[PDB]
Design a binder for this molecule. Structure first.
Ligand SMILES: CCCCCCCCCCCC(=O)OC[C@H](CO)OC(=O)CCCCCCCC
Ligand SMILES: CCCCCCCCCCCC(=O)OC[C@H](CO)OC(=O)CCCCCCCC
Ligand SMILES: CCCC[N+](CCCC)(CCCC)CCCC
Ligand SMILES: CCCCCCCCCO
Ligand SMILES: CCCCCCCCCO
Ligand SMILES: [Tl+]
Ligand SMILES: [Tl+]
Ligand SMILES: [Tl+]
Ligand SMILES: [Tl+]
Lengths: 219, 103, 106, 103, 106
């Protein structure tokens, strides 16, 4: 099961600092190394550094400015990476991976999305999207739900608690003066709806919120 | 169990502990040093063996001060153990040769 | 520090065709190259380790080859699930490094 | 303090003097030779150790006549000292084995 | 004898921006590269030793990286005091050699 656990997001004001965590499970060897990889939107993987928890020794990529500090809590199997005095340049997804001391990254975390801005955290408004009365359909029907007015990224949108996967598209968010907006679209066979329920679950980590929205026919 | 044989055994067990500890400490020492290649445990264990035996092919070797220090211990533990096996064999031959001379 | 070059940033292939991703090392590194797959909004997933060693849980469709400076990750008969960014990474010399990546396009 | 142990000690101290002198003389010998790499004291001391132990990874080695001469002394001092430790261990085993045989 | 190439002879950067100086070695030299700073009418001043080792008395703004043939001296957030000529030098093989130098321009 899930070996590395990282919190979905962290908002940070320019100049401030934050500490991301990476709780590990599964096998643990004194030979294990925990790595941190930075990925900026539209960019590749960048190696930040590593740590040998069973010793506390950490090394850093000397090719980039050192904004991090690695530490680990052997008892709580938790590795922490402290990012200090951030700027918009530091906004990105930060993954942690476990390396058995053999050179490759066997497992990775989901990654924490870090956003550096003065803006305020705003949960999203999850409005539904059902076809209008004059809309005809065929073997399939397309529903959806609007996630608007949120900050910062990201937002995980699932359908029927993840039980509904096919026919799903979640469009990239667009930034509108300090607030994000995106829509997710699901497609099921016409016959099945609303006979069978169809709900969109919207989780917004930065605001520790999670909301549901049943997509029912229009009045 | 004669002394030379108990020592030979002790020596072998110990050398094996130095090979493992050493491999672990070499990697720990070498990471952080750009260009270092003695940085993963499996080949590090292989490195330690070829160092203990003094073969030193040149495929792996420490570049850091602490890694080289680890190396010295491994070399010395390797040279000393095997040498101690040589001395244990000499004892065995001397005593048998004694009996043979009826001394 | 070892530079890994991933030839074309994007690769266009027809459904079911064979595709090969190139990863060049700035110096000789044995077979200490490992490939990762990353889909949109996803975490990297280890596909091949040590240039050609297969990973269980990974389709036999994927295979890697090469040694020294030139390495290739191949997908025999590409399919939609394979659309993603592919990265190569080296563990030959410290520090570990990644290739810029190559996007598979069908 | 038996002879073999006094010699072992003397040997170790001496080998350490050869490692230091040798490192100093190697650098002194190698500088001035284009392409030479055995030219700075710290790694030179590391070179001397891997030469005395006969490991010789190949990361460093003299290219000049005098540097190689320094090398020979270091190799021989290394091979001789360790061998002298082997012989000291053999003596220890032979004498204990004597007592054990009640000879 | 090892040739050290210092990429562009002059580097233009905006106040407070990050700047990187390149120094290429004609062959593989580990991390045996050392950086020097020299202001107008001044003597060279050691900034970084062994590619990335910091020198006390030198701003933390300065840092170096690389190994093998490619080395980089970086200045995080450049300031006027930093205007000078930057040289790299190698101690891997005799004789020691210097790079032609790179001038920092703000
Ligand atoms: C503790 C040491 C780890 C356990 C031992 C071997 C694991 C091999 C592996 O899974 O790694 C394979 C990898 C090449 O594919 O590394 C390698 O380079 C293989 C090195 C093998 C060295 C063996 C030395 C034996 C005296
Ligand atoms: C007399 C010898 C000098 C004192 C010893 C070490 C100084 C290290 C240094 O400041 O130099 C570091 C430098 C790499 O940064 O050189 C190096 O390549 C480090 C070589 C370390 C070899 C140690 C061998 C021990 C058996
Ligand atoms: C004259 C060369 C001697 C090399 N020895 C012994 C022969 C090995 C085939 C290597 C021992 C390796 C355990 C001793 C080195 C002593 C420094
Ligand atoms: C022989 C004593 C151990 C060698 C030094 C290990 C250093 C590990 C890194 O800090
Ligand atoms: C073993 C005698 C010393 C070796 C020769 C040293 C030469 C130094 C340079 O002139
Ligand atoms: Tl040898
Ligand atoms: Tl050897
Ligand atoms: Tl050798
Ligand atoms: Tl060799």
């Amino acid at each position: 099961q899930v070996q590395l656990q990282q919190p979905g997001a962290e908002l940070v004001k320019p100049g401030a600092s934050v500490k991301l965590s990476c709780k590990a499970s599964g096998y643990t060897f004194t030979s294990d190394w925990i790595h941190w990889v930075k990925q900026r939107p539209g960019h590749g993987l960048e190696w930040i550094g590593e740590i040998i928890p069973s010793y506390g020794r950490a090394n850093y990529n000397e090719k980039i400015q050192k904004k991090a500090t690695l530490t680990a809590d052997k008892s709580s199997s938790t590795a922490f990476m402290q990012l200090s005095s951030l700027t918009s340049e530091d906004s990105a997804v930060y993954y942690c991976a476990r390396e058995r001391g053999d050179g490759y990254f066997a497992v990775w975390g989901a990654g924490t999305t870090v956003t550096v801005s003065s803006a305020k955290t705003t949960p999203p408004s999850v409005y539904p999207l059902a076809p209008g009365s004059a809309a005809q359909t065929n073997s399939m029907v397309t529903l959806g739900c609007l996630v608007k007015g949120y900050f910062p990224e990201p937002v995980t949108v699932t359908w029927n608690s993840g039980s509904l996967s096919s026919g799903v598209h979640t469009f990239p968010a667009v930034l509108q003066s300090d607030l994000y907006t995106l829509s997710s679209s699901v497609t099921v066979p016409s016959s099945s709806w609303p006979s069978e329920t169809v709900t969109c679950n919207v989780a917004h980590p930065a605001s520790s919120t999670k909301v549901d929205k049943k997509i029912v026919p229009r009045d | 169990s004669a002394l030379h044989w108990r020592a030979a055994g002790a020596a072998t067990v110990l050398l094996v502990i130095v090979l493992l500890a050493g491999s672990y400490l070499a990697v720990l020492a070498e990471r952080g040093a750009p260009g270092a290649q003695l940085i993963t445990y499996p080949r590090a264990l292989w490195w330690s063996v070829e160092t203990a035996t003094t073969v030193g092919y040149g495929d792996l070797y420490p570049v850091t001060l602490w890694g080289r220090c680890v190396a010295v211990v491994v070399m010395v533990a390797g040279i000393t153990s095997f040498g101690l096996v040589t001395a244990a064999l000499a004892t065995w031959f001397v005593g048998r040769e004694q009996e043979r001379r009826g001394h | 520090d070892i530079l890994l070059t991933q030839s074309p940033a994007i690769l266009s292939v027809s459904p079911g065709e064979r595709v090969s991703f190139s990863c060049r090392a700035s110096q000789s590194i044995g077979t200490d190259i490992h490939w990762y797959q990353q889909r949109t909004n996803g975490s990297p997933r280890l596909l091949i380790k040590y240039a050609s060693e297969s990973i269980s849980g990974i389709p036999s469709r994927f295979s890697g080859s090469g040694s020294g400076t030139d390495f290739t990750l191949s997908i025999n008969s590409v399919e939609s699930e394979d659309i993603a960014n592919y990265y190569c990474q080296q563990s030959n010399r410290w520090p570990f490094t990644f290739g810029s990546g190559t996007k598979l396009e069908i």
